Design a protein around this ligand. Structure first.
Ligand SMILES: Nc1ncnc2c1ncn2[C@@H]1O[C@H](COP(=O)(O)OP(=O)(O)O)[C@@H](O)[C@H]1O
Ligand SMILES: Nc1ncnc2c1ncn2[C@@H]1O[C@H](COP(=O)(O)OP(=O)(O)O)[C@@H](O)[C@H]1O
Ligand SMILES: [Mg+2]
Ligand SMILES: [Mg+2]
Lengths: 317, 168, 372, 399, 187
């Protein structure tokens, strides 16, 4: 696979099986996801009632960012009071699901896609702010730079979802710039990530893919706007990949795909580093075989009599 | 490869072909048994002095001989740590299949990355005037492989970056 | 250090060797080809990709792709493969023990230069490297110090006037018509006589046809009128298939694309008008010397009689009071290399390298502020 | 501090059962097969499990990395692990502890390769290797609250590729008594396919044989009496509906295979000449070779495991045969001596988690706090080298 | 199509069977919207199989060959050509043009010729050109139902024009200019 999936496959399959089934069964399984997020599935009250919980270390910051309302108008009346040890909880009963199959399938997909659904609140807020500044600047072109600066100052938003990762996003009259504070431990991971990040920068440059958002990466130094932001170390070992999303990159027909893509970026990079390790393994063995071919000299020709198959010559003559 | 490694390569060739005058010899401490004397090192009167060939501080060729067995360990260049990881993994794969090589050790001596071990029997049955040919051929081809594999790493990183980024 | 590497990674051909030598140790086409069939045979040493002379020899069952397009590298994988070939398979010298010299056409994107420098420094770990322009190399080779250089090659044609020790960057004219476009036009206009060339092997065959037969006339209208009475102008060529083909007015028509770019449907001045404009863009006090020193360089300028026709057109354009002289050494095919080697074998050049210790402390942008 | 939940891997010959510690069921139970070709590069165009099964004629060639319990090809195994982890299991290796399992009697080289792949390609926090059995003993006891652990018995783990009869006494596994028969569900599946072959049925696909076992086969007391009963009784002649790809209502008339297939376990001569000792006799030899004091515990508790022990009347027949043999020996001793005895009873035990007893035992074991201390930490691997797990411990004494 | 019909079991060697295969391609062949998914669907050969009646009365059946041979247009490597598909060639021809004239080239594609009458060729070409071309603008395909004779219709329209009569190549010009008048008169 080349592109990482955008939701939890186990939740999707479980929901599909339990919706299409006729005899439900009690289940209690806790499932982990990428980036430390953990999901818990249980049926404590009724065999036909399923409760799903979300765990995330940065969730209170999401609440500060205004994610409760987004979750509410995303998931309707399904909202349920959170369970112990978890952040967001949902309770679903199979007796009230829509009869039509496509509604059930889309509900299962939406529930399985809870990760980005809860993580996309800052992106939606940034898009709304970008629209506001766009219309305000269209009201008077001469009033752009000062409102742009005040938006870079006040609306500068940030989040820490991993302890070596950070998203810094802020809107403007025409763009929503985002900064990733990438850093890889596990030395060999950082070793391969250096090459991966270098090649990832070049990509955009090539005229072949100029339609993509502009990338900006420079290790050992952060951009001008985030040196004063708390949490950003003074370039200890952290890279900083910056994507500039213009108006065309979040057109009303392409917002969700862009959000999911920009969210999954880092996990894609990690998984593909591992895939590159496997690629080495296979090539390296594949032509150490050629070295063995080179060695197979220095063996005088000899003759084996039959050695027919799964046995020893199967005959005395 | 060559046109570049003439003196080091020829010195290794000459030393190896001089050090391969092996002989069948039993064990002087255990009866009705024969062991490679270079690996045990219990009877010093039959162990020729250890010999080292080098071209630069990062390339060495330790040549330890004996009456029946010869162990020959080398170091190959690792200019940057990318080549360090590549060399380590590749040479591990190389030694992992020593069963079909007959002149390899499953684990190199410390401070090295590979150790050949030519016991008498290999010279007894396998004609040995091309074992050294394989030795030198490998000593150059290995650097060739490391360079090629780092090129392939760069290429695959470029391909995955383009594939990820184009789908915005 | 004894000697320093130097590589002229041109669009069509690549020239490599040691500094101070007077002969290319290695010249092979800049071609990387992949197989396009199954291979029901057993063994044969199935090689995934053939590059250089091997690809040129086995083009029968391969599809060939040029990594460099119009002077800008577009397939960095193939470029790295070609550099690896030059380093290991033909010159067979360790990159880490030899400073290298590279060549890049003027006005190329800065991405090309930065990526090339970074690749040479990190993937090959060369001790030091330098990037130089073709026109400066041509002047170094010719022994001159003043004179506008016309460098027409496989990928791009550019003009860089240079006074005594100084270059005028504002008067540099770059034209994207070159040998590849000429070969494409020859393929297009060989169809009108029946012969059809499609695959990349046919493209190489047409390139050989242009090598052996194409030439530049003196007066286009008179030459066409002479070709109308097609008696003593046609020639013949032998394809590897054994079939003999006849060449006619298109023998000299396709070289005229340089002087009349409208033949391939591009709105631009010819290789003489661009030179005239480049000279006129310079200061008035140096035109009287730039006219007397017209330098021809590159593979494309090897057509018979191109120098005479270019001199005629430049003399017609320029005022008659000042004479026009054009020069083209018989070894101008490797003039860029000769200048590169002369520059690399200079004592005063030793402190103008870019060492690894200098590179890693400033990033890949150092090449922009040091090389040029 | 508070670590993440351990992950319970399982790589059987036919099925691989991933999951987590503390769960009540494996998250994924899918076949151990990977699809592979021969503008995505050929490095990544691979599918595993049910996706591989469905995508079989679309341009991929399936291959089973594990056969007879031992891994032959390593590219397939490593690609299987990476696909599982980063596609279905959805975990980051560096922040979790793994509990791998693999059949006993494996070469130390295989364990070394598994450890080095796990700590280099992935480099997880810790890796622990357990023997397919053990976990079976752990999952044997149902109401495991504080005390009611048998901790002494025999586990007959019969699976897809190879079956293992391993005795356990007071927790420790007696190596000298370990014996293994190289016949399992796959060999009898090939036998069923050959039986379909000889009768020239319209469809003879291997999946058809698997389903024929799934809803048809059962164990019988003896073969000649069962043949006579089949001749007399005419309602034992079923016709399984196949529907292979397009052959609608192509019913397959099953026959004597329904009792001829399971009999290989109690009569291994049919499968091949590589083994000739019937399973009850082999279990008797295993128990007799054990130390004298633990024979009562070995006979009293016998635990079935694996998916190939789900045959009806399998446990009944095994218990009957073992009880008959032990009675024969005891009575022979009695008439040799001339005194009565209380005898020894045999209780072959089957439980509600027969199919995935190994996984359930692993999940129950991983939850213990002391499990973390037993894992191979990454620092130990980077210090002592890649041969940290080569000393084979359960069967046989090193040096 | 003749070459790939052999693997099924039907042999068509000489010219008569060549015309027969041409008639088969007239009525059975079609262009699939996508190739890999349709090839996968061909395994469940339920809605893909079709029957044709030869002049000899022998009935033949055809499966994936219905869409395998029309795909050669988009994949010229099947018949052993190192060329690009029709969509790729059209995109390259558009790209070779001037910068500001690509609006109408993208927004106006004329589908002419007898071979362009396959069921679903227009949709596949539209999808492919949309994929290659930038997504900013729209791509349109103009496929008139009478495109089979479009060349003749246009020729009649041109000949009926009241300004074309001055451009005729009269015999008087040929009587003095030789046969080369057409080179510098027509185009
Ligand atoms: N004698 C010749 N006559 C005509 N064309 C030539 C001749 N020699 C070379 N060429 C053309 O010039 C090209 C050589 O390009 P080259 O000058 O090596 O490019 P660069 O200067 O970028 O290295 C070839 O592709 C060939 O088509
Ligand atoms: N109900 C059943 N009855 C008999 N055999 C079965 C049944 N279900 C599965 N089997 C077979 O027994 C094997 C054992 O299952 P499992 O333990 O998951 O495999 P493995 O031994 O590869 O780990 C299955 O792979 C299958 O071939
Ligand atoms: Mg050049
Ligand atoms: Mg098993």
């Amino acid at each position: 696979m080349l592109s990482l999936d955008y939701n939890n496959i186990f939740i999707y399959e479980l929901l599909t099986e339990r919706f299409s089934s006729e005899n439900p069964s009690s289940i209690d399984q806790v499932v982990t996801d990428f980036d430390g997020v953990t999901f818990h599935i249980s049926t404590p009250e009724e065999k036909t009632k399923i409760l799903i919980s979300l765990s995330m270390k940065c969730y209170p910051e999401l609440v500060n960012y205004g994610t409760l309302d987004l979750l509410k108008q995303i998931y309707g009346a399904y909202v349920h009071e959170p369970e112990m040890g978890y952040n967001f909880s949902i309770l679903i009963d199979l007796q009230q699901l829509p009869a039509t199959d496509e509604e059930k399938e889309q509900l299962a997909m939406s529930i399985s896609m809870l990760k980005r659904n809860v993580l996309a609140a800052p992106f939606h807020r940034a898009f709304t702010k970008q629209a506001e500044l766009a219309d305000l600047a269209r009201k008077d072109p001469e009033n752009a730079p000062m409102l742009d600066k005040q938006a870079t100052s006040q609306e500068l938003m940030a989040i820490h979802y991993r302890d070596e990762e950070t998203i810094v996003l802020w809107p403007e009259h025409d763009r929503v710039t985002v900064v990733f504070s990438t850093k890889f431990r596990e030395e060999t991971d950082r070793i391969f990530g250096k090459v991966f990040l270098q090649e990832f920068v070049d990509a955009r440059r090539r005229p072949a893919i100029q339609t993509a958002p502009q990338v900006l990466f420079s290790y050992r130094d952060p951009p001008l706007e985030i040196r004063d932001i708390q949490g950003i170390q003074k370039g200890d070992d952290f890279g900083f990949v910056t994507f500039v999303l213009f108006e065309r990159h979040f057109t009303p027909q392409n917002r969700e795909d862009c959000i999911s893509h920009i969210q999954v970026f880092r996990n894609t990079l990690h998984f593909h580093i591992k895939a590159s390790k496997a690629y080495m393994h296979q090539r390296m063995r594949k032509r150490v075989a050629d070295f063995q071919k080179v060695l197979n000299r220095a063996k005088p020709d000899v003759e084996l009599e039959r050695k027919t198959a799964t046995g020893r010559s199967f005959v005395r003559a | 490869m060559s046109n570049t490694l003439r003196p080091y390569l020829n010195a290794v060739r000459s030393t190896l072909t001089a050090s391969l005058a092996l002989e069948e010899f039993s064990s002087e401490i255990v009866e009705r048994q024969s062991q490679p004397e270079v690996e045990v090192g219990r009877s010093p009167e039959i162990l020729l002095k250890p010999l080292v060939v080098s071209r630069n501080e990062q390339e060495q060729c330790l040549i330890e001989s004996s009456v029946n067995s010869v162990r020959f360990s080398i170091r190959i260049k690792q200019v940057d740590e990318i080549e360090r990881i590549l060399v380590r993994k590749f040479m591990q794969f190389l030694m992992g299949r020593a069963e079909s090589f007959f002149i390899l050790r499953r684990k190199p001596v410390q401070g090295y990355d590979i150790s050949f071990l030519i016991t008498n029997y290999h010279t007894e049955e396998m004609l040995k005037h091309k074992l050294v040919d394989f030795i030198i051929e490998f000593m150059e081809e290995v650097d060739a492989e490391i360079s090629e594999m780092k090129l392939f790493l760069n290429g695959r990183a470029r391909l995955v970056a383009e594939t990820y980024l184009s789908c915005f | 250090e004894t000697t320093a590497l130097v590589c002229d990674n041109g669009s069509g051909l690549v020239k490599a060797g040691f500094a101070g030598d007077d002969a290319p140790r290695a010249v092979f086409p800049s071609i990387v080809g992949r197989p396009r069939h199954q291979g029901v045979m057993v063994g044969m040493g199935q090689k995934d990709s053939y590059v250089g002379d091997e690809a040129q020899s086995k083009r029968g069952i391969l599809t060939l792709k040029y990594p460099i397009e119009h002077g800008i590298i577009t397939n960095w994988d193939d470029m790295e493969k070609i550099w690896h070939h030059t380093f290991y398979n033909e010159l067979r010298v360790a990159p880490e023990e030899h400073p290298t010299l590279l060549t890049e056409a003027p006005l190329n994107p800065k991405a090309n230069r930065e990526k090339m420098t970074q690749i040479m420094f990190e993937t090959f770990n060369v001790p030091a490297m330098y990037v130089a322009i073709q026109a400066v190399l041509s002047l170094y080779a010719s022994g001159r110090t003043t004179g506008i250089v016309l460098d027409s090659g496989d990928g791009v044609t550019h003009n860089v006037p240079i006074y005594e020790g100084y270059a005028l960057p504002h008067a540099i004219m770059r034209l994207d018509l070159a040998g590849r476009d000429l070969t494409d036009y020859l393929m297009k206009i060989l169809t009108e006589r029946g012969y059809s060339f499609v695959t990349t092997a046919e493209r190489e065959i047409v390139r050989d046809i242009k090598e052996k037969l194409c030439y530049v006339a003196l007066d286009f209208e008179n030459e066409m009128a002479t070709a109308a009475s097609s008696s003593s102008l046609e020639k013949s060529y032998e394809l590897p298939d054994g079939q003999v083909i006849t060449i006619g007015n298109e023998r000299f028509r396709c070289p005229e694309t340089l002087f009349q770019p409208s033949f391939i449907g591009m709105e631009s001045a010819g290789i003489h008008e661009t030179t005239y404009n480049s000279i006129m863009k310079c200061d008035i006090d140096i035109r009287k010397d730039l006219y007397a020193n017209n330098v021809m360089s590159g593979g494309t300028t090897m057509y018979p009689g191109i120098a005479d026709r270019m001199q005629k057109e430049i003399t017609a354009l320029a005022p008659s009071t000042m004479k026009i002289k054009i020069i083209a050494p018989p070894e101008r095919k490797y003039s860029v290399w000769i200048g590169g080697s002369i520059l690399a074998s200079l004592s005063t050049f030793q402190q103008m390298w870019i060492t690894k210790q200098e590179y890693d402390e400033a990033g890949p942008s150092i090449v922009h502020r040091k090389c040029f | 501090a508070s670590f993440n939940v351990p992950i319970i891997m399982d790589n059987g010959t036919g099925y691989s059962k991933l999951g987590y510690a503390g769960n009540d069921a494996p998250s994924y139970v899918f076949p151990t097969v990977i699809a592979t070709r021969s503008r995505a590069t050929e490095d990544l165009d691979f599918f595993i499990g049910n996706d591989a099964l469905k995508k079989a004629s679309a341009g991929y060639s399936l291959d089973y990395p594990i056969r007879h319990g031992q891994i032959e090809n390593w590219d397939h195994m490593e690609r299987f692990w990476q696909q599982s982890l980063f596609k279905y299991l959805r975990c980051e290796p560096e922040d979790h502890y793994f509990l791998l399992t693999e059949p006993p009697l494996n070469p130390p080289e295989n364990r070394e390769n598994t450890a080095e792949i796990m700590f280099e390609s992935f480099n997880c926090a810790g890796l622990y290797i357990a023997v397919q059995a053990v976990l079976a003993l752990a999952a044997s006891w149902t109401s495991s609250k504080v005390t009611d652990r048998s901790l002494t018995g025999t586990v007959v783990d019969s699976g897809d590729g190879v079956t293992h009869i391993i005795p356990v006494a007071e927790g420790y596994v007696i190596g000298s008594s370990i014996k293994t028969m190289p016949l399992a569900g796959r060999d009898v599946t090939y036998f069923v396919q050959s039986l379909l072959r000889d009768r020239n049925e319209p469809d003879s696909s291997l999946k058809t044989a698997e389903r024929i076992k799934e809803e048809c086969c059962y164990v019988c007391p003896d073969i000649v009496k069962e043949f006579s009963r089949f001749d007399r009784e005419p309602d034992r002649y079923l016709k399984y509906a196949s529907e292979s790809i397009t052959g609608h209502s192509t019913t397959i008339d099953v026959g004597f295979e329904r009792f001829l297939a399971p009999e290989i376990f109690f009569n291994p001569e049919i499968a091949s000449s590589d083994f000739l000792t019937p399973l009850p006799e082999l279990v008797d030899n295993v128990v007799q070779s054990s130390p004298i004091d633990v024979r009562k515990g070995l006979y009293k508790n016998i635990v079935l495991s694996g998916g190939s022990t789900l045959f009806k009347n399998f446990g009944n027949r095994l218990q009957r045969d073992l009880k008959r043999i032990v009675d024969e020996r005891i009575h022979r001793s009695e008439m040799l001596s001339g005194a009565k005895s209380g005898g020894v009873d045999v209780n072959v035990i089957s439980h509600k988690r027969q199919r995935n007893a190994v996984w359930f035992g692993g999940s129950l074991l991983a939850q213990t706090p002391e499990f973390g201390s037993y894992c191979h930490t990454k620092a130990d691997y980077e210090e002592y080298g890649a041969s940290i797990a080569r000393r084979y411990q359960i069967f046989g004494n090193s040096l």
